[PDB]
Amino acid sequence: QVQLVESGGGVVQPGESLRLSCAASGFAFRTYGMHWVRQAPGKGLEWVGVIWYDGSNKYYGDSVKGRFTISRDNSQNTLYLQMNSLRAEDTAVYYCARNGERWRVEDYYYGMDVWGQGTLVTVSSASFKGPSVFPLAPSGTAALGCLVKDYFPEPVTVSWNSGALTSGVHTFPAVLQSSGLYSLSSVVTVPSSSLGTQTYICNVNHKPSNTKVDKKV
Amino acid sequence: KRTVDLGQCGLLGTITGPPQCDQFLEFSADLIIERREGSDVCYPGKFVNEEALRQILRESGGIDKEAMGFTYSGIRTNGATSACRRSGSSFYAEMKWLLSNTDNAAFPQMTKSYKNTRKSPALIVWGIHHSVSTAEQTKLYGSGNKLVTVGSSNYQQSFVPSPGARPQVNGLSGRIDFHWLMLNPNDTVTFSFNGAFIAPDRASFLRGKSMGIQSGV
Amino acid sequence: EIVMTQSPLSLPVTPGEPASISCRSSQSLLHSNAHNYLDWYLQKPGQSPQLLIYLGSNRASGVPDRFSGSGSGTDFTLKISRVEAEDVGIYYCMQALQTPITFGQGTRLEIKRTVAAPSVFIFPPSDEQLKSGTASVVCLLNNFYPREAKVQWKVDNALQSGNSQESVTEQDSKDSTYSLSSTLTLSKADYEKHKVYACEVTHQGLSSPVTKSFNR
Ligand SMILES: CC(=O)N[C@H]1[C@H]([C@H](O)[C@H](O)CO)O[C@@](O)(C(=O)O)C[C@@H]1O
Ligand SMILES: *[C@@H]1O[C@H](CO)[C@@H](O)[C@H](O)[C@H]1NC(C)=O
């Protein structure tokens, strides 16, 4: 099984450096070119760069050339990405990937046949913060929910009635606000009937800040 | 005198690249020391005509690798095995194990050819996979008769995988044996297979001149 | 710098029906060895990209027969002969010829169904949230199709610009609909400094724009 495992992502501050690594199993790593491709939330793939099998040449995409460096330890089957001068825009999942073919340089083919699971990098100067959890109170079907507001970083998870109320739930993708903080809402439709008999509390988990909140609505 | 101690890597393994040879895949030396510990394979099987091939290599000066350029559509090319371990199931660094895209699917009839464009002879190697049973052969390549043919300017041979059980080695009772020819400049080898074929991905060109010895010093 | 231009960017397909995606290239991708250095990648929701087509027309390891790739020089095409549910995601073409490697914008393949109207609900700010400093008014659009939606925020029959962010779910794997959240943010100041609150929703499946209201 060819397997690429990225690690080293997390929250980092604008201007800092950070180093990602990619562990490779399944293949003579030392004979293959390796790439880094990144993807910013809700955006397309963007090539970061490539390293040749012996580390003699490297090439980088336009938006990171100058600030990122690629390198490899063939002795330990490990690819590395050194990011410097992190800007907010650099926020993305960083994927590691193998150059499938090993063709002569003059015909070098840069396809990538195997891709890792990716590692998340958040560049932000916000501080960790648990969310505030306000209700969305209903006016044959009614809709109630919770607004989960001003937390950082992602992710939060939400549930209803511990894990009982599952059907008809929708939890939305967070959005980033200008404050630097995230916010998201979660709603479930119920029979306006049950409204008064069965109780509905939402359970918000924000592990990154060790914050748990149960609001009744 | 630039000298190489193949240790656990057998001289022939430098051409097909079992894990134990990952560091000699393109060795260069004037003196080649082999060890009784050295091994040519990882999956059970042998090199046919292996002693003639051993003398070409001992006096080769090293090996230069060069992609052959074969590409494929409609099959899997990522066949791997517990017998060839790189932190997981792997294979021979210079060879591709071709098989049907899904269990029991019909492996397509295929014809691939390669022309030696360089100025010295090229070492071409390929493998016949003998499955442990008819049913495994069918699971991997689909049912029916299998046939590999290989031709060059003066040479023609067909090869018929004979599935059957051989003595359990490293838990496997199937076999992969390696056949080889020396392809003179401007000559062409032509493969024609419909399964049970272990295709070369890189060819080996001799580097120069060297003496080989299997000592214990 | 090879530019890659894909189209369409959004591709609703009825299950079992065919699908076609186009990729054009600012430079020829045909190398002197008769190969077109053009790849296709798929990214299924929440998964990494995976190889689909390499060198213009080759189905990579594992890729079923319903996919195929074609083209020459600068003009390339990915056909799926009979779309399956498991095939939704974002298709990327990518030139593999010259650094810097570049990608198409991505074509988002989604399941096509008959239109379905958005059951609209509106929510006023909480007392807890009001007791803070700001007010958040939330409009929900539940299980509609297609995803294109006109969500309009009414505060005493004035128009709002910059006061709302928005958020859609991913296509339901059961009913192929979406849901949408519009969240209007203003200060307790300007919240009280007005009275009636309503969100107007117009959808291909609604005969006439539907509004939901509440008064502070
Ligand atoms: C390509 C392929 O089929 N690989 C599989 C093979 C073959 O079926 C047989 O080994 C050949 O006889 O067998 C395994 O047991 C192994 O060797 O680890 C499982 C592995 O996935
Ligand atoms: C091989 O062919 C090329 C042209 O096709 C020619 O330049 C070269 O001399 C040939 N070499 C031999 C050994 O015939």
TrEMBL record, chain B:
Post-translational modification: Palmitoylated.
Glycan attachment residues as annotated in the record: 186
Disulfide bond positions: 9-21, 42-84
Location(s) in or outside the cell: Host apical cell membrane; Virion membrane
Residues that coordinate or bind Ca(2+): 26, 64-65
Domain of life, per lineage: Viruses
Family statement: Belongs to the influenza viruses hemagglutinin family.
Assembly information from the UniProt record: Homotrimer of disulfide-linked HA1-HA2.
General function of this protein: Binds to sialic acid-containing receptors on the cell surface, bringing about the attachment of the virus particle to the cell. This attachment induces virion internalization either through clathrin-dependent endocytosis or through clathrin- and caveolin-independent pathway. Plays a major role in the determination of host range restriction and virulence. Class I viral fusion protein. Responsible for penetration of the virus into the cell cytoplasm by mediating the fusion of the membrane of the endocytosed virus particle with the endosomal membrane. Binds to sialic acid-containing receptors on the cell surface, bringing about the attachment of the virus particle to the cell. This attachment induces virion internalization of about two third of the virus particles through clathrin-dependent endocytosis and about one third through a clathrin- and caveolin-independent pathway. Plays a major role in the determination of host range restriction and virulence. Class I viral fusion protein.
Protein name: Hemagglutinin
Gene symbol of the encoding locus: HA
Coverage span on the entire protein: 64 to 280 of 560
